[PDB]
Every structure is written in structure tokens, then in C-alpha cells.
Amino acid sequence: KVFGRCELAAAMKRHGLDNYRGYSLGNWVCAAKFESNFNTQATNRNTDGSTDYGILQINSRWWCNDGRTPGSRNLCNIPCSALLSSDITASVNCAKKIVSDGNGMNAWVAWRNRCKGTDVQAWIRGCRL
Numbered sequence: 001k002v003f004g005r006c007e008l009a010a011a012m013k014r015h016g017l018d019n020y021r022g023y024s025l026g027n028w029v030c031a032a033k034f035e036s037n038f039n040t041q042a043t044n045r046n047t048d049g050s051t052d053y054g055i056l057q058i059n060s061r062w063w064c065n066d067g068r069t070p071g072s073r074n075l076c077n078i079p080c081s082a083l084l085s086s087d088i089t090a091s092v093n094c095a096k097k098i099v100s101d102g103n104g105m106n107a108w109v110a111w112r113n114r115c116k117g118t119d120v121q122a123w124i125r126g127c128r129l
């Protein structure tokens, strides 16, 4: 599923991401935009052999099991395929764990490089929330 900008903002808020660990809704939508272009089915292979899955490109190195990432962990305790569902619940629950792990949203390199410090409020401008 490819979410609309405001559609995704609304889904994220409903699932408790708005201001979660102090990260305003705009931060999450910005991250999703640059990680996946709002596409729940997005995947990308990393140089180390791990794979990133879903709207927030959660990595199989640490967070989900894809059965093809040697020596990895599955800390969200979910198959990576669950991170590609049209329903964002699994991705949101797992992101809550990631953002809580000490480094906040810096875990998402694109967020650090493209969203951090920017006018992220613009990502939710005009949205009925």
C-alpha cells in the first residue's frame, strides 16, 4: 500500500506515534517519506546482507527475522514480512522499540540526514488529525 501523506500521518497518530519518545508526528512522516516514499511494501538490501522492510525500513540485522541474515537478532519478535503489511501496526510497534533503544530516531539514517533539524511540521501541514 502506498499511503497518502496525511493518510499516513493519521494512521501513525492513531497507533500512538505522535510525540512518542518526544518525536512529533512530522518527524515520523518525514522519516517514512525518505525511507519508503510511503510504500508499505518497500524493501532494500544492505551491503552487509541484511534487508530493510516497510514504511520505516526496519532492518533485519536487529529487529525482525527474514531467515537470511546470519548472526542477526529479532528484537521485535516478528517476521520481517509482517513489516510489509498494508496495516502499519507491526511497523509502528517495532519502531517504538527501536526509538526507545538509546539513540532515538538516529537509528534511521535517512531521518538524521534528511529530517533532523528541519521544519518537519510541514509534513503534517493541512492534515485533518
Ligand SMILES: [Cl-]
Pocket (backbone or CB within 6 Å): 001, 002, 039, 040, 041
Ligand atoms: Cl504497495
Ligand SMILES: [Cl-]
Pocket (backbone or CB within 6 Å): 005, 033
Ligand atoms: Cl508527499
Ligand SMILES: [Cl-]
Pocket (backbone or CB within 6 Å): 024, 025, 026, 027, 120, 121, 122, 124
Ligand atoms: Cl511536527
Ligand SMILES: [Cl-]
Pocket (backbone or CB within 6 Å): 043, 044, 045, 051
Ligand atoms: Cl529486496
Ligand SMILES: [Cl-]
Pocket (backbone or CB within 6 Å): 049, 050, 051, 060, 066, 068, 069
Ligand atoms: Cl536480508
Ligand SMILES: [Cl-]
Pocket (backbone or CB within 6 Å): 053, 054, 055, 056, 057, 058, 083, 091
Ligand atoms: Cl517498516
Ligand SMILES: [Cl-]
Pocket (backbone or CB within 6 Å): 065, 066, 067, 068, 069, 070, 071, 072
Ligand atoms: Cl536470519
Ligand SMILES: [Cl-]
Pocket (backbone or CB within 6 Å): 073, 074, 075
Ligand atoms: Cl532475538
Ligand SMILES: [Cl-]
Pocket (backbone or CB within 6 Å): 021, 022, 103, 104, 105
Ligand atoms: Cl531522543
Ligand code: NA
Pocket (backbone or CB within 6 Å): 021, 022, 023
Ligand atoms: Na524527548
Ligand code: NA
Pocket (backbone or CB within 6 Å): 041, 042, 043, 044
Ligand atoms: Na520491495
Ligand code: NA
Pocket (backbone or CB within 6 Å): 060, 061, 062, 063, 064, 065, 066, 067, 069, 072, 073, 074
Ligand atoms: Na534478524
